[PDB]
């Protein structure tokens, strides 16, 4: 077989995810390979597998991970490693996708001379660089009237902001200009402050999708920018698991309280308020919250939110915090009431300018109206706490929408927007020791984006195959649609969850049991963890992920009793509070349903548009400049879906050669008898001699298309021929010189 003496293979290892080994004895088809390791090992071939071969070294280090003739995990994890460590090249294609690695170190590559260097060049002309994506988006926008998107995905901290910043700097410089980039950059402090959280694995994890769309005029000067947001993680406001925090702004606010402006708010320390307290981790190292507050207000001022409105915003957030402390005493399983003269509610009503006795009444009662007649009826302490928390979530989400709208008012330029290019920062696939409703939603939005990606790539390769006049069916569509139907179809997991909210005496045990009854054996993608009746497993594109049921029915509930809003709109103490709501079914929709709807808006926004993809990875946990760790890298190359992109590309014809470059490599195999001066037909003859099977290569007009493993086989046989020739020559000469010393010895 391909395994021989002088072979090389990758073998798995604990401390670098793969290591090289040289195959010390030729293998014949039985449970053993003798291997030599840069010293000696014997390695079981085990059920069967064979270890992944190692690519011939003329292919390693090139600009494109699909240029490798063996496509598998350790080849990627090798190329990205050598190219990052040795060359200090941080950008690399994987087919369409650009992969970018965070160096944690400044570099000269963003210089303006290079901005000029990329402008006007096609993707073939140059090495990969972010400007080579921006340039393609620009010229496609000009070429063909359609709008263009750029889509950026990675663990937070993998540099999605810096990637966007240099992207838009390309537009500003290439177009000429009007000072947008300064404004857009200056917005980021506040949207980090309201939008990001600490997480078990990360700090300044962003919990929402931020879409920045740069508008161009008919000159293709930059007009200006809009911003939209999707997929905000509302449930974090009221619930955090251990070592998580609430959105930063609550802790910036509480840490500020000693400042005079906030004296009125009566803010305690961050461990006093029930919404900050729960996850038990008030202080982050490497940040001081009290400075970050100042930086937030300074960004608000630069974006032109007046100090009156800023004090409004902080009022409302102190409202949300104080609202959290309200305590309900049950009088019955039917009914609950607030303790008399209970202080948190007194402070909330004073802050918000409403009657203590109205909020006291409406928090604990709900109102139902027939056509003619209306009833006020009490509700249990559970329904009361669910409603208070739904009011907290609904305020926060509206406040977030209002801040985003003021930012837009400062970013817009008042000119017809002829077309736009839009830059999407979104989180990648997520997995922890524990997975919960937030992770479930994040992974479902990634299943949707991954489907869009696959379908676009399939269209592109159909266009290229018609361009080389090759019949299509040879490449075929791998599809994650059955996992999407598993999640979001009717009788899917989300459907059965929204059902279980309204069903009487719903609980996570009866939910898990509904899931098992519906799916347990009927779908290959759903599985039950062997030892638990409270968890379930979904086989997502990246990997299997296990979710606990134990949270979801708390987190998924939104219902907002309209009367509590009609109370808040009556507030006249300050302008902002009615201004938030000013704007019926939405008050019934559960969090999961709002997430689906926000995701449908996003996918329609992107299907309007033609995407380009960027991926970002942290190479290590400790920000060490230009150091790379295989065990984080393989994690993120799964999470970013690159390792299935390559798997999907490995079926089909990933290796492509032009006939001229094919001669330039492989004249050595051909006899001068076999060479015609028709090169294309020469190759059609030769390759059919050399590779037996018409399947494994397609001829086309200007290129040859190869199945993966074949160009490696050609390199093997080329190296063997060239070695055999070297042997013949060197033995001939060395025998002659030995004979010549014998000539001296006779003499």
């Amino acid at each position: 077989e391909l395994y021989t003496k002088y072979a090389r293979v990758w073998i798995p290892d604990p401390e670098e995810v793969w290591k090289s080994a040289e195959l010390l004895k030729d293998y014949k088809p039985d449970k053993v390979l003798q291997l030599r390791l840069e010293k000696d090992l014997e390695y079981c071939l085990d059920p069967k597998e064979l270890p992944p071969l190692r690519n011939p070294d003329i292919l390693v280090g090139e600009n494109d991970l699909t240029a490798l003739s063996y496509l598998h995990e350790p080849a990627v994890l090798h190329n990205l490693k050598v190219r990052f460590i040795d060359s200090k090249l941080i950008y690399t294609y994987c087919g369409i996708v650009l992969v970018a690695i965070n160096p944690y170190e400044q570099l000269p590559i963003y210089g303006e001379d290079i901005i000029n260097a990329y402008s006007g060049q096609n993707m073939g002309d140059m090495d990969p660089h972010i400007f080579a994506v921006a340039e393609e988006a620009y010229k496609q926008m000009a070429r063909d009237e359609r709008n263009q998107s750029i889509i950026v995905s990675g663990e937070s901290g993998a540099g999605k902001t810096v990637s966007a910043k240099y992207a838009m700097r390309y537009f500003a410089t290439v177009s000429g200009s009007a000072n947008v980039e300064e404004k857009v950059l200056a917005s980021n402090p506040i949207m980090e402050s309201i939008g990001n959280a600490k997480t078990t694995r990360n700090d300044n994890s962003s919990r929402f999708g931020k879409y920045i769309e740069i508008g161009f005029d008919k000159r293709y000067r930059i007009i200006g920018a809009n911003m939209r947001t999707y997929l905000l993680e509302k449930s974090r406001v009221v619930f955090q698991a251990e070592e998580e925090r609430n959105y930063h702004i609550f802790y910036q606010l509480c840490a500020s309280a000693a400042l005079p402006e906030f004296k009125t708010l009566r803010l305690g320390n961050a461990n006093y308020f029930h919404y900050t307290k729960q996850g038990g981790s008030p202080v982050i190292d490497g940040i001081d919250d009290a400075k970050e507050m100042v930086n937030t207000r300074q960004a608000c001022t630069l974006l032109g939110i007046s100090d009156s409105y800023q004090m409004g915003i902080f009022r409302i957030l102190a409202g949300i915090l104080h609202l959290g402390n309200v305590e309900f005493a049950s009088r019955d399983s039917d009914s609950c009431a607030i303790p008399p003269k209970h202080d948190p509610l007194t402070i909330f009503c004073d802050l918000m300018g409403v009657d203590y006795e109205e909020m006291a009444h409406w928090l604990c009662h709900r109102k139902l109206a027939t056509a003619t007649e209306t009833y006020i009826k009490p509700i249990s302490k559970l329904h009361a706490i669910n409603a208070r928390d739904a009011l907290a979530k609904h305020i926060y989400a509206n406040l977030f929408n209002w801040i985003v709208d003021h930012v837009n008012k400062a970013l817009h330029s008042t000119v017809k927007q002829h077309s736009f290019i839009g830059v999407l920062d979104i989180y990648g696939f997520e997995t922890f020791e524990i997975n919960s409703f937030e992770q479930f939603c994040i992974n479902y939005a990634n299943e949707k984006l991954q489907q869009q990606f696959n379908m676009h790539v399939f269209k592109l390769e159909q266009e290229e195959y018609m361009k080389e006049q090759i019949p299509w069916t040879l490449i075929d569509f791998y599809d994650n649609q059955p996992c999407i139907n598993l999640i979001e179809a009717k009788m899917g997991v989300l459907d059965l969850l929204d059902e279980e909210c309204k069903m009487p005496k719903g609980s996570d045990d009866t939910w898990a049991q509904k899931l098992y009854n519906t799916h347990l054996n009927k779908c290959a993608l759903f599985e039950k963890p062997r030892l638990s009746n409270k968890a379930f497993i979904i086989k997502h594109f990246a990997d299997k992920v296990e979710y606990q049921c134990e949270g979801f029915l708390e987190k998924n509930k939104d219902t907002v009793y309209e009367e509590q809003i009609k109370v808040l709109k009556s507030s006249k103490k300050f302008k902002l509070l009615p201004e938030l709501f000013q704007d019926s079914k939405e008050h019934k929709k559960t969090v999961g349903h709002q997430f689906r709807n926000s995701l449908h808006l996003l996918m329609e926004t992107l299907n309007a548009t033609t995407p380009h993809y960027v991926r970002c990875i942290k190479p290590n946990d400790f920000k060490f400049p230009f150091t790379f760790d295989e065990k984080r890298a393989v994690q993120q190359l799964r999470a970013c879906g690159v390792l299935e992109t390559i798997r999907i590309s490995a079926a089909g014809f990933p290796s492509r050669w032009t006939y001229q470059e094919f001669f330039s490599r492989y004249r050595v195999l051909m006899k001068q008898k076999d060479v015609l001066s028709d090169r294309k037909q020469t190759c059609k003859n030769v390759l059919e001699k050399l590779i037996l099977d018409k399947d494994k290569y397609q001829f086309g007009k200007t290129k040859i298309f190869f199945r993966a493993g074949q160009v490696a086989y050609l390199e093997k046989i080329r190296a063997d021929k060239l070695r055999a020739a070297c042997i013949r020559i060197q033995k001939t000469i060395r025998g002659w010189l030995m004979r010549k010393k014998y000539m001296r010895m006779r003499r």
Partner: protein, 139 residues
Amino acid sequence: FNKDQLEEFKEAFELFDRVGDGKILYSQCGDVMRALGQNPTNAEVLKVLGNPKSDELKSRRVDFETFLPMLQAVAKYEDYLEGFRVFDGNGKVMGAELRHVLTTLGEKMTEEEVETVLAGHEDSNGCINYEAFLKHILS
């Protein structure tokens, strides 16, 4: 082999005897075969030697009589040309490239051996006429 061949081969063998015992080392056997017109690879020499270990290859000594069957066994152009055409298509070969391939592939030789054989045969551009070089080294 006839008496004349056996006499010429024994005489040649004894000229290579550097100890006076009428013997050569195993490691010289290949040298004697090459001096006697054979062009064996190191692998072929070790095979006819019985794949000796380093110790007996370096110190066990054999006389002509034990060597002779091996020479006999060893004894029993267009490919050479194509082999040179491998490194071409104007009929030339870089001297630098030939040096590299001879010092890095196959049964690698020393740079000094390559300099010795290549001396005077490469031109100012650094090109070798390989048909002439081959005829020269085969004579």
